[PDB]
Design an enzyme around this catalytic site. Structure first.
Site, short mmCIF file in Angstrom:
data_model
loop_
_atom_site.label_atom_id
_atom_site.label_comp_id
_atom_site.label_asym_id
_atom_site.label_seq_id
_atom_site.Cartn_x
_atom_site.Cartn_y
_atom_site.Cartn_z
N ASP A 224 -47.01 -6.31 -1.69
CA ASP A 224 -47.45 -6.04 -3.09
C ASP A 224 -47.16 -4.39 -3.33
O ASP A 224 -47.37 -4.37 -4.71
CB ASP A 224 -48.90 -6.42 -3.08
CG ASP A 224 -49.64 -5.79 -4.13
OD1 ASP A 224 -49.53 -6.49 -5.21
OD2 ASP A 224 -50.42 -4.94 -3.97
N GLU A 225 -46.91 -3.52 -2.51
CA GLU A 225 -47.13 -2.23 -2.64
C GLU A 225 -46.21 -1.41 -2.07
O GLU A 225 -45.49 -1.69 -1.25
CB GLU A 225 -48.37 -1.72 -1.95
CG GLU A 225 -49.60 -2.36 -2.22
CD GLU A 225 -50.73 -1.91 -1.52
OE1 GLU A 225 -50.41 -1.74 -0.10
OE2 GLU A 225 -52.12 -1.50 -1.78
N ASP B 145 -47.75 -1.23 -7.41
CA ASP B 145 -48.85 -2.20 -7.12
C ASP B 145 -48.50 -3.38 -7.84
O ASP B 145 -48.80 -3.23 -9.26
CB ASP B 145 -50.39 -1.83 -6.87
CG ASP B 145 -51.24 -2.84 -6.49
OD1 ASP B 145 -51.19 -3.95 -7.51
OD2 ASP B 145 -51.70 -2.99 -5.37
N1 DTP Z 1 -58.33 -11.62 1.41
C1 DTP Z 1 -56.95 -12.07 1.39
N2 DTP Z 1 -56.55 -13.25 1.95
C2 DTP Z 1 -55.18 -13.45 2.01
N3 DTP Z 1 -54.38 -12.93 1.05
C3 DTP Z 1 -54.56 -11.93 0.62
C4 DTP Z 1 -56.06 -11.39 0.40
N4 DTP Z 1 -56.15 -10.33 -0.34
C5 DTP Z 1 -55.04 -10.11 -0.77
N5 DTP Z 1 -54.14 -11.08 -0.49
C6 DTP Z 1 -52.75 -11.18 -1.09
C7 DTP Z 1 -52.65 -11.82 -2.20
C8 DTP Z 1 -52.31 -10.74 -3.32
O1 DTP Z 1 -51.73 -11.33 -4.29
C9 DTP Z 1 -51.88 -9.67 -2.59
C10 DTP Z 1 -51.79 -8.27 -2.98
O2 DTP Z 1 -53.34 -7.95 -2.94
P1 DTP Z 1 -54.14 -6.95 -3.82
O3 DTP Z 1 -53.32 -5.85 -4.42
O4 DTP Z 1 -55.30 -6.30 -3.08
O5 DTP Z 1 -54.78 -7.76 -5.16
P2 DTP Z 1 -53.66 -8.63 -6.15
O6 DTP Z 1 -52.32 -8.23 -6.01
O7 DTP Z 1 -53.91 -10.09 -6.10
O8 DTP Z 1 -54.25 -8.33 -7.48
P3 DTP Z 1 -54.39 -6.64 -8.23
O9 DTP Z 1 -53.50 -5.74 -7.29
O10 DTP Z 1 -54.29 -6.65 -9.65
O11 DTP Z 1 -55.81 -6.58 -7.55
O12 DTP Z 1 -52.08 -9.90 -1.11
CA CA Z 2 -52.70 -3.97 -3.04
CA CA Z 3 -51.81 -6.05 -6.18
#
Ligand code: DTP
Ligand code: CA
Ligand code: CA
Ligand code: CA
Length: 341
Positions: free
Chosen positions: A105-106, A7
């Site tokens: 992201d994953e 991730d």
């Molecule tokens: N509620 C949302 N609305 C729009 N885009 C989003 C939302 N949540 C997440 N995303 C997008 C932005 C993130 O950079 C990406 C992956 O989210 P996520 O892995 O859950 O958190 P993150 O990558 O921002 O930080 P981390 O993995 O360290 O929590 O997807």
């Molecule tokens: Ca994620």
């Molecule tokens: Ca992430």
DNA sequence: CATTAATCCTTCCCCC
DNA sequence: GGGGGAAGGATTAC
């Protein structure tokens, strides 16, 4: 079986940091402006600087500016993040051909046929982190266990810039001591149905007659949660093809006038057909978010694929159908295309 | 205040 | 009774 999940960390914001390194150290907020009033919108994500103070995804941009008036606020550029994500995925692809790109992201990797125990796995983990750091200057978190679900959980514990192993012993402990709300797939609505049935940990699913659990939360979740608590969950890591493409936009203001909403909708369609790029859907759905944030939608499957002009006129009928069947004003409008040939 | 997509569920519907 | 498939909605998660 050994599953390695990856991730990327605060991904969109990190990418925006990578493209303009001055941003490092400062709180950075990547956000989606909705074009109504100034700073109308929501936060897509923020880095750890901003997130320390309660600025996370989903919160309005106005709440964020009250909290951190002097943070850097940036519009979302998904296509850029998309291209960077593709490149990172290709690195990981050179560590196994068994790879499930779950999202931007994953990704999970079956590395059973590569490494031979949880130490070698840990090494493979670091040298992958190390690589993406070198090649692309991006921090990721890595989670490793026997199935996908626990590998994901491992990563959530470890973030940011983490790596974690949940060996077969700690899984047993987590089935007993992890909150059901922290299981992938258990959003709010499910979690509150499980507290009412008196299920707060994974193991309490065994306690109850299957057939009641099926009643409350559905068969599929029931079976999933049951298999998980029996150390029996084991879905394979498989490639996944996108089944659906579309786009919703917010209108400057709410409306029920056909002619006022059409241009928003036609723009949604064009952006969709471009994104299709040589893909041809047999199905089209028109989606509307109403003034009070309920969602309504109307669709049609065709015996053949859909031309651009067909989508235009078919959407207008479906929109007409939505208006005739709900009296609320419309806030957002869009299309989805599916059932590709 | 409030910005893409998968999978699941329920309800119809057609028909052996 | 039950297969099959479509529509519309519910839920989740990024
Ligand atoms: N509620 C949302 N609305 C729009 N885009 C989003 C939302 N949540 C997440 N995303 C997008 C932005 C993130 O950079 C990406 C992956 O989210 P996520 O892995 O859950 O958190 P993150 O990558 O921002 O930080 P981390 O993995 O360290 O929590 O997807
Ligand atoms: Ca994620
Ligand atoms: Ca992430
Ligand atoms: Ca959860």
């Amino acid at each position: 079986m050994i599953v390695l999940f990856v991730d990327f960390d605060y991904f969109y914001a990190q990418v925006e940091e990578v493209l303009n390194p001055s941003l490092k150290g400062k709180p950075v907020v990547v956000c989606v402006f909705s074009g109504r009033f100034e700073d109308s919108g929501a936060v897509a994500t923020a880095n750890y600087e901003a997130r320390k103070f309660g600025v996370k995804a989903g919160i309005p941009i106005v709440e964020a500016k009250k909290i951190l008036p002097n943070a850097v606020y940036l519009p979302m550029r998904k296509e850029v993040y998309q291209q960077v994500s593709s490149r990172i995925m290709n690195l990981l692809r050179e560590y196994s051909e068994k790879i499930e790109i779950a999202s931007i992201d994953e990704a999970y990797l079956d590395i059973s046929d590569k490494v031979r125990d949880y130490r070698e796995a840990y090494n493979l983990g670091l040298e992958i982190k190390n690589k993406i750091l070198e090649k692309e200057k991006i921090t990721v978190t890595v989670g490793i266990s026997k199935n996908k679900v626990f590998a994901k959980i491992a990563a959530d514990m470890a973030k940011p810039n983490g790596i974690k192993v949940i060996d077969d012993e700690e899984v047993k402990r987590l089935i007993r001591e992890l909150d059901i709300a922290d299981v992938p797939g258990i959003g709010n609505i499910t979690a509150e149905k499980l507290k009412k049935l008196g299920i707060n940990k994974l193991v309490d699913t065994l306690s109850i007659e299957f057939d009641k659990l099926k009643g409350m939360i559905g068969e599929a979740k029931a079976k999933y949660l049951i298999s998980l608590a029996r150390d029996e969950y084991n879905e394979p890591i498989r490639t996944r093809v996108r089944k659906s493409i579309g786009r919703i936009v917010t209108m400057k203001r709410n409306s029920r006038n056909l002619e006022e909403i059409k241009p928003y909708l036609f723009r949604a369609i064009e952006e969709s057909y471009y994104k299709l790029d040589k893909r041809i859907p047999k199905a089209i759905h028109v989606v509307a978010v109403t003034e009070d944030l309920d969602i309504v939608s109307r669709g049609r499957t065709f015996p053949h694929g859909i031309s651009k002009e067909t989508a235009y006129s078919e959407s207008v009928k479906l929109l007409q159908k939505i208006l005739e069947e709900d009296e609320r004003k419309i806030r957002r409008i869009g299309v989805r295309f599916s059932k590709f040939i």
